[PDB]
Amino acid sequence: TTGRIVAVIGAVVDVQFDEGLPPILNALEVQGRETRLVLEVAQHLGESTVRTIAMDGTEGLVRGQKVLDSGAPIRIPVGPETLGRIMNVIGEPIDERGPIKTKQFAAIHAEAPEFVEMSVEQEILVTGIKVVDLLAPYAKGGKIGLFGGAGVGKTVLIMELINNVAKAHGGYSVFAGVGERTREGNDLYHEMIESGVINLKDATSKVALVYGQMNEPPGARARVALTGLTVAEYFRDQEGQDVLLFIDNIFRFTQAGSEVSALLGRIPSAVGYQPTLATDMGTMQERITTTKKGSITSVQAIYVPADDLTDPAPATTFAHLDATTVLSRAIAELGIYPAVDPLDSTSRIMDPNIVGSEHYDVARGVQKILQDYKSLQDIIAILGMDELSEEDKLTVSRARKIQRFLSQPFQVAEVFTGHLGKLVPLKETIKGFQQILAGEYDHLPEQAFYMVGPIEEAVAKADKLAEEH
Amino acid sequence: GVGKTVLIMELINNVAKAHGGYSVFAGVGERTREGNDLYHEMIESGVINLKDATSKVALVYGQMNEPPGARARVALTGLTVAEYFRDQEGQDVLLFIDNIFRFTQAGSEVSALLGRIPSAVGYQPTLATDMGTMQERITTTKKGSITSVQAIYVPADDLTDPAPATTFAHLDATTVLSRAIAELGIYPAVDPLDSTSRIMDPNIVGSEHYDVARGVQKILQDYKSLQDIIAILGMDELSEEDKLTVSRARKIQRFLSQPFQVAEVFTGHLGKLVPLKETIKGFQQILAGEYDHLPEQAFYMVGPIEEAVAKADKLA
Amino acid sequence: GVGKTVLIMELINNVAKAHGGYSVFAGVGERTREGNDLYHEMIESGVINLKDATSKVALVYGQMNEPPGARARVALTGLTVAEYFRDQEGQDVLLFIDNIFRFTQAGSEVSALLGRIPSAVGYQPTLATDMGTMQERITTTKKGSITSVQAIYVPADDLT
Amino acid sequence: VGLKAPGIIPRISVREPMQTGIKAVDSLVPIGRGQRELIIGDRQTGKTSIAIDTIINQKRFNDGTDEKKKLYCIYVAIGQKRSTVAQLVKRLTDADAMKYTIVVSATASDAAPLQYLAPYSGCSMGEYFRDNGKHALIIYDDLSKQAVAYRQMSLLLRRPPGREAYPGDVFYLHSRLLERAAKMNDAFGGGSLTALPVIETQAGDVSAYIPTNVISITDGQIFLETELFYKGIRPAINVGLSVSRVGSAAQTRAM
Amino acid sequence: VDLEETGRVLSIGDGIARVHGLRNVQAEEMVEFSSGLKGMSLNLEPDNVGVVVFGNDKLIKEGDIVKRTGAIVDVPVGEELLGRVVDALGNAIDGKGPIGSKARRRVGLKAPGIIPRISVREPMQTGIKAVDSLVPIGRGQRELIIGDRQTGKTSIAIDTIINQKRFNDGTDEKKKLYCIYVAIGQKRSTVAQLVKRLTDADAMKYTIVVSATASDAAPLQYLAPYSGCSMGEYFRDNGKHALIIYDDLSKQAVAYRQMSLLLRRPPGREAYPGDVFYLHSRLLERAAKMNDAFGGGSLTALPVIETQAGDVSAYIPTNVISITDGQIFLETELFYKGIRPAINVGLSVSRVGSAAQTRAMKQVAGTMKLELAQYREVAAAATQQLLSRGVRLTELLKQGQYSPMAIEEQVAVIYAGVRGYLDKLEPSKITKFENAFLSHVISQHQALLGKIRTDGKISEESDAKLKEIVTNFLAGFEA
Amino acid sequence: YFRDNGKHALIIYDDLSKQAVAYRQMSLLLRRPPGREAYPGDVFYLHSRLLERAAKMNDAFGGGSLTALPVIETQAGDVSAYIPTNVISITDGQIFLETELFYKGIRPAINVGLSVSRVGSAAQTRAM
Amino acid sequence: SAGAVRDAGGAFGKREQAEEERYFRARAKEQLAALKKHHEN
Amino acid sequence: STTSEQSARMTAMDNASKNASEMIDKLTLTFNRTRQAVITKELIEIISGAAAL
Ligand SMILES: Nc1ncnc2c1ncn2[C@@H]1O[C@H](COP(=O)(O)OP(=O)(O)OP(=O)(O)O)[C@@H](O)[C@H]1O
Ligand SMILES: Nc1ncnc2c1ncn2[C@@H]1O[C@H](COP(=O)(O)OP(=O)(O)OP(=O)(O)O)[C@@H](O)[C@H]1O
Ligand SMILES: Nc1ncnc2c1ncn2[C@@H]1O[C@H](COP(=O)(O)OP(=O)(O)O)[C@@H](O)[C@H]1O
Ligand SMILES: Nc1ncnc2c1ncn2[C@@H]1O[C@H](COP(=O)(O)OP(=O)(O)O)[C@@H](O)[C@H]1O
Ligand SMILES: [Mg+2]
Ligand SMILES: [Mg+2]
Ligand SMILES: [Mg+2]
Ligand SMILES: [Mg+2]
């Protein structure tokens, strides 16, 4: 069957057929082009006509141009051949290494795992980050969200997790570049070659790469998230192994929808977004999950426009996550990195039965003193530190040390900071904050706890500062 | 009602009288009686002569009583009169528009009826280009020259409104009139931390003019930062360094105020025309701390610094 | 928690006792639970009587369980009952509306569903007229009068 | 799914207590059988935890022989993810609560019309117990996401939108739902349906459009603060703002 | 009359020609009217074609014959455009004859992918003390110049362009950087003074000026940034390096909106189109650093954004901030105080710790970075070292217009402030100190400055030589 | 009629605020593009053409006059609102009344700082 | 809610953080002297 | 000196709370004006979007 292009307005393209009308979500190959141009069917307008969305630039297209129906949706390479290889939304390689010689294929659109296929295994995942492991620890198989404003440190945080987790993890991984800087994709590609994750000379790679950056049109960025998770769905379902699914940034998926929602014929919803924001996110997010067969531990970076967490895009995403890491700009401007909010980061596994009572009491103890510290700051604004009582002065002294002891220099961010990277164990993290709350380091200065690994280096740094003074 | 018409009448009273070339007034969507007031006042002064053929001003009027199409195109009509003197004759023209917002305001009314999709805050989508084609004509070419003092209305005291916001790009010098400053009694109510100019540069005006100008804007900024602390706690809780900063700032605020010649009928005080060189010396002395002993109200509504000291001597 | 229903019942009683005028209670868009609470309190007090014809109130309910078309016209229904006692019997009538915000909300919902471009703060273009045509009927006349005690929910505690 | 609520006559003031098993609630903000008590607050404040503990607490009465004091629970998951409902159903199974609990689930993957109907479907199931002399509890978790589903449905049908892009009758959506939850007098069976709607406030904003509607419908509300949660108050129920007008009468004299 | 190749106008108003026919026309293809004006077919519909008119549409009547160029919208590119003021389409508008270009490149080409790119190595010197030391820009980077009206946004761009003279006059070819200024919605008097300012500083001979002013139609203002980017790509691909300044992207979005709304495309947030992020993203992504295999050159982008009342959280600003690598906030508070340029050191950042500063600046700037951060906390007992030092350094960060300094010259003025030769000196006298000190070192000590450039760092001999200069200069300055 | 036939007349629009909302109703039902507080673009033109007709005629045109006293209702003393500022920019002076002064019993409650009338000052008795 | 003064980032917020930083700069110098004397003696 | 200092604190804190209350009343009105403006503006974006279709 063949169809002719009848209208072209931006990313949206209308194609009319004579008899063989294609269903929705089908890939349409546009004939008479230099590069490949896939159009995905969105709506059936009527009178044997369908409204589609372009996966690449629409410049050059003419009215009455031939368009062939593929028959099935956008199908892409899947298996071990995708590892160590960059690919498009539509599946074509873009790393200048010839075609991908895959055995099996897989459609980017598919029904989400049913209620009976859901797992309930909540095992802790030790990242090596002090703020995460203590306050909002991630689960092995669960869904992890990294909320943050512009430049607060989402991309540095996700690459730190790729550095720590993916190398230690034996199974395969997948990185989905969605509407972000291609420069970062270039840096991420060469960095994994240096560390020895992606291998060029032989086939022993542990990371698959899918990229649809902000240079691409709306249709491309709205579908790479599906293209990315489809590769992870193979490593979940077909191969019985654990998988890691890194995404950056998942906001650009929901953003990309709104860029063409007006042209598709939808009435705009609140804050300029599409009315299908909940369902389009729902059908996508629900596929990214740990089934009974496999297990995908996802780590999604979430952009928050103007640090506004009430915005529909991030607000709707909170329901889909098991563990959250909300990055704050106010904390970032103090110098505390990673700028994770200790009073706005939660997790399902944060329970005395799951991670023990010693983990729970210390973690909650840090959040108690940090919350009380905010109440005193209001009183300090008028009175001052000197006028306060000894009980209140002690609360602020311990709290400010705990704030700075949460900070940690990453291995990925050595060039930014200057200090050497660290990686604190689980029991070392728990013991560190336990001693500070108990009041065993009241005599030491607060500067020693800023940007250090375990509690041992805080005492060691206090010696260097003592000698200099 | 902040003081644009009073300001533009003063500038005409000051500059347009002491000028060799011609002048052009364009009443765009404003009060019709003001046109009558201006017309007879110019006959009284002599700039518009009925008997002789030596008139220095050309009047054009499409006031708020007229329909939108008239008010939308009258700005271009008066503009074209000034362009003739610039292009063909080659004269230094003094253009005066009041109010240029009514050009853009009239555009929005017809835009609705022209069958266009409305832009932000119900404005026309062609807000920038309609103003652009109009404003770009008002400029000094190689042959002639046009000096335009345009009064700009601000809807609901909101400078972020599309109409005034777009106008900022088409201006060499801005003069933001605040209501808060007017309500205090400081006339003209020109906001010193908002009004700006492109010729304000040490290369053009000089380092003495520049350094004194930014010294005034610095201490007023420092005074504005402490308003929250003064309101709640008070002046007593401020340090001695801060007390001096506040005292001088209030005196500098009041010395910026000035009695106008056009406002002689309204206020009663005689108008003052302060020279350029004496203006810099006045504020420079206050910044250095040569008049800390004097009170604040002595600086309120005076010409040069000499009359401020004379007013303080009157008080005892 | 402030004896609202007790005050309402007393104004019904005292106006009927002194001025000899019957009352009307228009339940506009509030809780049906509250309508049940008041109905039995009025029977307990005596302003409503199920045994004999000595009742002082005519109840007209159209609560939040009913559609916006109903809720918008409930005040007019109760108003019309009050207009009888003024126009025909020549009485000083007492018309309660609980509450006037829900009459305004229902008018906003009906206007929205018709597809009329909304006014300021999401309210209908016909805000003043819808209120005006109802409130103007509540007045003193040659024959009698209708005094109205209208409950008001101020949204967001904002009088503007 | 579409049925009108009981009128004036069939109803009666709330009398029998609805025990949640939470000290802060049962003592200071008591709920009654047939009442509509809102569970409102920010994300991660423990809204669902109030509902789940209430369902687990009913095992004490349902295991007993006294029929009047029993309570059949209903949890309506709206716009959640399946792994969360899977965890939720496991928790009720572990506590031996599922045997008397219905779980209606319209998850994020499901189409908008299903999320729109799920509360009304769940309500009609609860109405069966009310109209047979028995008592039922229903939890709408949450009505915020229902409005988004109803908005999507109405907007794509080209129906005229209102405030915050929600349709004109967005207030009527929750009103007709919640009004169906009631306490029937002896003459009309004697049963009851108790509603526990849930709302997600953005940044503690109780005066937002959808919260304000549901607060004005319900007989009371239980405000949950993020500040109180981290300070140590768990459950983080703000006593000052949280109230229950109807359920104060429906409470044991001992308490 | 052939309806396939040519077409007749159905309706024309507000620069939107609806054309009947043109059945073989492509999307985003240029078209010529009977009057002579050019257009661009964006909306292809079954019954008509929505064409936008490049220039004044008032000559176009109903039933006019619309021809085809038979090619996607493109502009001329090359080295002949250097020193020439041109419009959005690439035509000369300075009365210096036609352009002698022998090459054309499309306006809307895709940005280089993952393979052609490479990490940013080379430095992009703006010649500004506050920028090069604290917020260093590398070649093939996007650095946003955000700020309010009249806060020296354009002033940063001009000082950067004039700073390239020392590199372009030199023998080294790879150290060069050709500039490309793009004016969007600015009045011609502002651009006329701008080009003269470049002409007076001998800066035009290596700079291109794409002028799309307010008198010009919205399609030209929309296209102008893409046309200038294509001219920059010519250098990027073919070995050489280039700089481009979008001044500004805020007024482009207003033009793009006007054009879109008149094409009957539905409005979005603040009446803007749905894809205003896509507008600036595809433009900025083209700015990149190419590897040696493809060429080695790069394209550095300096986009400008105008914020209303210091609202960086607005719609269009938040879009551009997320796109660009780093941003430079220009606050009005510092501006009115006297701190010019008014670059907020706390908020402004640059995401690149590569060889942008060089080894000489890295030493002196690193210590200045900490001390200013220490100062900013205290600024809001024996501890006046931190408070004084910070105020002294802040005065050194001031810099007059049209006076860009070399990297070695900037190290000299900072060396005095960091080591503590301005502590006892009065804050107001630092402007006169630096003026006389900078003029002194440039006049006589050329070998010192030359050795810092040769060694690329402050050596032990140069450190000892600098000590003797500043200590004697201080004593001479004071009475 | 009086103005043109050499007679002086007074007119009181009580109030133009309630006229504006009436004209807003018509415009919103006409489906015209709304702006500030859902008011159409020509709400200024609505009151401008009305008030301009109030004028003082010279002896050549009868020597009559028409004096206008338009009324405006502000919400919470917000004189900077859209409709007040439009009517303020048309009229030749304002008489602002405050709730504070009126509540204390100072009646008529007139804000002397904000209320002005420079045009009427010229037409005042020398005794006053 | 709590911590609203520092969230606003006004004069009171900046003066509050400056006050804290001053106090703990003093206490830092005292405690470093304590570590000096403890290390030596 | 204590009784004089205590009475001044009482008076100073009284004025601070009263001056703060004065500013809250102003900000409450400014908040309500801006609250309505955002509701009205954002609605006009949606109506304009629907009308354009
Ligand atoms: N470093 C400086 N020293 C002295 N004056 C300066 C400096 N920087 C800018 N100015 C002055 O400020 C004025 C405004 O600067 P500029 O036009 O570059 O800012 P802008 O944000 O581009 O303003 P706009 O875009 O509205 O024209 C200039 O006319 C100039 O005289
Ligand atoms: N009484 C309590 N004591 C201790 N922890 C509690 C209590 N109640 C809730 N929590 C904890 O708080 C977290 C959030 O609980 P819950 O999911 O019920 O809140 P929620 O507001 O419904 O979250 P969401 O809105 O995101 O679904 C859980 O991890 C839970 O363990
Ligand atoms: N762990 C960290 N240590 C030090 N600086 C960091 C860290 N994370 C982020 N940053 C700072 O933020 C910038 C990078 O932020 P980025 O990860 O790009 O945020 P986003 O992805 O949200 O834009 C860098 O310039 C760096 O200074
Ligand atoms: N220089 C001034 N001195 C004193 N009062 C002034 C001055 N300028 C304006 N005013 C006051 O402001 C009022 C309105 O001035 P006007 O120029 O008409 O404002 P607008 O142009 O905004 O309508 C006048 O009635 C006058 O009382
Ligand atoms: Mg990022
Ligand atoms: Mg005026
Ligand atoms: Mg929940
Ligand atoms: Mg500029």
Query: Rounded to whole angstroms, how far apart are CA atoms E250 and E232?
Result: 21
- CA-nearest of F66, A267, D13 to C115 is A267
CATH architecture entry for A350-469:
Orthogonal Bundle (1.10)
- CB contacts under 8 A, A 36-95 vs E, are 57-64, 86, 94-95
Which residues of F participate in catalysis according to the annotation? 118
Q: Of the listed C10, C17, C30, C51, which one is catalytic?
A: C30
- Judging by DSSP bridges, how do beta strands A143-148 and A124-125 pair with one another? unpaired
Q: What is the DSSP letter of B230?
A: H
Chains with 3 or more CB pairs closer than 8 angstroms to A? Answer: D, E, G, H
Q: 3-state class of D50 per DSSP? A: helix
Q: Do chains E and D touch (3 or more CB pairs under 8 A)?
A: no
Indicate the annotated binding residues of C.
Answer: 1-6, 30-31
- CATH top-level class of B200-316: mainly alpha
Please indicate whether, in this complex, the C-beta atoms of A269 and H45 are within 8 angstroms of each other: no
Query: Rounded to whole angstroms, how far apart are CA atoms F77 and C52?
Result: 55
Query: Rounded to whole angstroms, how far apart are CA atoms A380 and G17?
Result: 9
CB of A387 closer than 6 angstroms to any ligand 2 atom:
no
Q: How far does residue D4's CA lie from ligand 7's centre (Å)?
A: 28
Known catalytic residue: A180? yes
Q: Give yes or no for a contact between A76 and A227, defined as CB atoms under 8 angstroms apart.
A: yes
> Mutual orientation of helices D170-179 and D209-217 as an angle, nearest 10°?
30
Going edge to edge, which strands form the sheet with B23-28? B57-62, B23-28, B92-98, B145-150
Domain boundaries, chain A: 1-73, 74-349, 350-469
Q: 3-state class of B297 per DSSP? A: coil
Known catalytic residue: C143? no
Tokens of F24: 């807003």
Q: Is G41 on the interface with D (CB under 8 A)?
A: no
Please state the φ and ψ torsions of residue F21, each to the nearest 5 degrees.
-65, -30
The dihedral built from the CA positions of residue D86, D87, D91 and D94, taken in this order, carries a sign that is: positive
Q: Count other C-beta atoms under 10 Å from residue E7's C-beta.
A: 27
Q: B123: which chain F residues are within 8 Å (Cβ-Cβ)?
A: 35, 41
Please indicate whether, in this complex, the C-beta atoms of F76 and H32 are within 8 angstroms of each other: yes
CB of E401 closer than 6 angstroms to any ligand 1 atom:
yes
Q: Of the listed C4, C17, C116, C143, which one is catalytic?
A: C4
The dihedral built from the CA positions of residue A388, A390, A391 and A392, taken in this order, carries a sign that is: positive
Q: H53: which chain E residues are within 8 Å (Cβ-Cβ)?
A: 266
Please indicate whether, in this complex, the C-beta atoms of D156 and A266 are within 8 angstroms of each other: yes
Distance set, CA E289 to CA A216, E240, E243 (Å): 18, 11, 12
Q: C61: which chain D residues are within 8 Å (Cβ-Cβ)?
A: 8
Selected for mutation to probe chain E from B108, B116, B117 (highest E CB count within 10 Å) is B117
What CATH number was assigned to the domain covering residues G1-41? 1.20.5.500
CB of A147 closer than 6 angstroms to any ligand 3 atom:
no
User: Which fold does the domain E358-478 belong to in CATH?
Assistant: Lysin (1.20.150)
Ligand 3 atom closest to Cα of residue A149: 22
Q: 3-state class of D185 per DSSP? A: coil
CB of A243 closer than 6 angstroms to any ligand 3 atom:
no
CB of E321 closer than 6 angstroms to any ligand 3 atom:
no
- Least CB-CB distance to B156: which of F32, F81, F90? F81
The reply, when asked if residue B5 is annotated as ligand binding, is yes
Indicate the annotated binding residues of E for Mg(2+).
Answer: 154, 247
Which residues of E participate in catalysis according to the annotation? 351
CB of A153 closer than 6 angstroms to any ligand 3 atom:
yes
Whose CA is closest to atom 3 on ligand 4?
Answer: B187
CA distance D91 to chain A (A): 10
Known catalytic residue: A92? no
Please indicate whether, in this complex, the C-beta atoms of B234 and H12 are within 8 angstroms of each other: yes
Whose CA is closest to atom 30 on ligand 2?
Answer: D46
List residues in chain C that are followed by a break over 2.5 Å (C to N): none
CB of B153 closer than 6 angstroms to any ligand 4 atom:
no
Domain boundaries, chain G: 1-41
Q: Is H2 on the interface with E (CB under 8 A)?
A: no
Q: Count other C-beta atoms under 10 Å from residue H34's C-beta.
A: 10
- CA-nearest of A76, A141, A468, A66 to A299 is A141
CB of A416 closer than 6 angstroms to any ligand 3 atom:
yes
Query: Rounded to whole angstroms, how far apart are CA atoms B198 and E154?
Result: 12
Q: 3-state SS string over chain A?
A: CEEEEEEEECCEEEEEECCCCCCCCEEEEECCCCCCCEEEEEEECCCCEEEEEECCCCCCCECCCEEEEEEEECEEEECHHHECCEECCCCCECCCCCCCCCCEEEECCCCCCCHHHECCCCCEECCCCHHHHHHCCEECCCEEEEEECCCCCHHHHHHHHHHHHHHHCCCEEEEEEECCCHHHHHHHHHHHHHHCCCCCCCCCCCEEEEEECCCCCHHHHCCHHHHHHHHHHHHHHCCCCEEEEEEECCHHHHHHHHHHHHHHCCCCCHHHCCCCHHHHHHHHHCCCCCECCCEEEEEEEEECHHHCCCCHHHHHHHHHCCEECCECHHHHHHCCCCCECCCCCCECCCCHHHHCHHHHHHHHHHHHHHHHHHHHHHHHHHCCCCCCCHHHHHHHHHHHHHHHHHCCCCCCCHHHHCCCCCCCCHHHHHHHHHHHHHCCCCCCCHHHCCCCCCHHHHHHHHHHHHHHC
Please indicate whether, in this complex, the C-beta atoms of A367 and D230 are within 8 angstroms of each other: yes
**Chain centre distance of CA C91:** 18
Please indicate whether, in this complex, the C-beta atoms of B136 and E217 are within 8 angstroms of each other: no
Selected for mutation to probe chain E from A95, A211, A214, A271 (highest E CB count within 10 Å) is A214
Burial group, residue E446, by CB count within 10 angstroms (0-12, 13-18, 19+): exposed
Mutate to test the pocket of ligand 3, among A162, A410, A416 (most ligand atoms within 8 A of CB): A416
Please indicate whether, in this complex, the C-beta atoms of E380 and G18 are within 8 angstroms of each other: yes
Q: A443: which chain G residues are within 8 Å (Cβ-Cβ)?
A: 31, 34-35
Q: How far does residue E367's CA lie from ligand 1's centre (Å)?
A: 29
Q: How far does residue D191's CA lie from ligand 5's centre (Å)?
A: 56
Closest ligand, as measured to the CA of B196: 1
What CATH number was assigned to the domain covering residues A1-73? 2.40.10.170
Please check whether the domain covering D1-251 is classified as CATH 3.40.640.10. Answer: no
User: Which fold does the domain E72-357 belong to in CATH?
Assistant: Rossmann fold (3.40.50)
CB of A79 closer than 6 angstroms to any ligand 3 atom:
no
Written as one string, the DSSP assignment of B123-178 is --TTHHHHHHHHHTTSS--SS-EEEEEE----GGG-TTSHHHHHHGGG-SB---B-
Q: B117: which chain H residues are within 8 Å (Cβ-Cβ)?
A: 48, 51-52
Tokens of E77: 């590119």
Q: Count other C-beta atoms under 10 Å from residue B186's C-beta.
A: 21
CB of E142 closer than 6 angstroms to any ligand 1 atom:
no
**Chain centre distance of CA E64:** 41
Tokens of A39: 């159009």
Ligand 1 atom closest to Cα of residue E150: 23
Q: How far does residue E323's CA lie from ligand 5's centre (Å)?
A: 9
Distance set, CA E468 to CA A459, E421, E455, E463, E473 (Å): 42, 12, 20, 9, 9
Q: C118: which chain H residues are within 8 Å (Cβ-Cβ)?
A: 43, 47
What CATH number was assigned to the domain covering residues A74-349? 3.40.50.300
User: Which fold does the domain B1-199 belong to in CATH?
Assistant: Rossmann fold (3.40.50)
Q: Give yes or no for a contact between D218 and D178, defined as CB atoms under 8 angstroms apart.
A: yes
User: Which fold does the domain E2-71 belong to in CATH?
Assistant: Elongation Factor Tu (Ef-tu); domain 3 (2.40.30)
Query: Rounded to whole angstroms, how far apart are CA atoms C152 and C98?
Result: 8
Query: Rounded to whole angstroms, how far apart are CA atoms B23 and B18?
Result: 11
Please indicate whether, in this complex, the C-beta atoms of A319 and D112 are within 8 angstroms of each other: no
- CA-nearest of A72, A10, A14 to A45 is A14
Domain boundaries, chain E: 2-71, 72-357, 358-478
Q: Give yes or no for a contact between E354 and E136, defined as CB atoms under 8 angstroms apart.
A: no
Q: H48: which chain B residues are within 8 Å (Cβ-Cβ)?
A: 117-118
Q: How far does residue A286's CA lie from ligand 2's centre (Å)?
A: 22
CA D210-D214-D216 angle, to 5 degrees, is: 115
Tokens of B69: 């199409």
Query: Rounded to whole angstroms, how far apart are CA atoms A445 and B275?
Result: 61
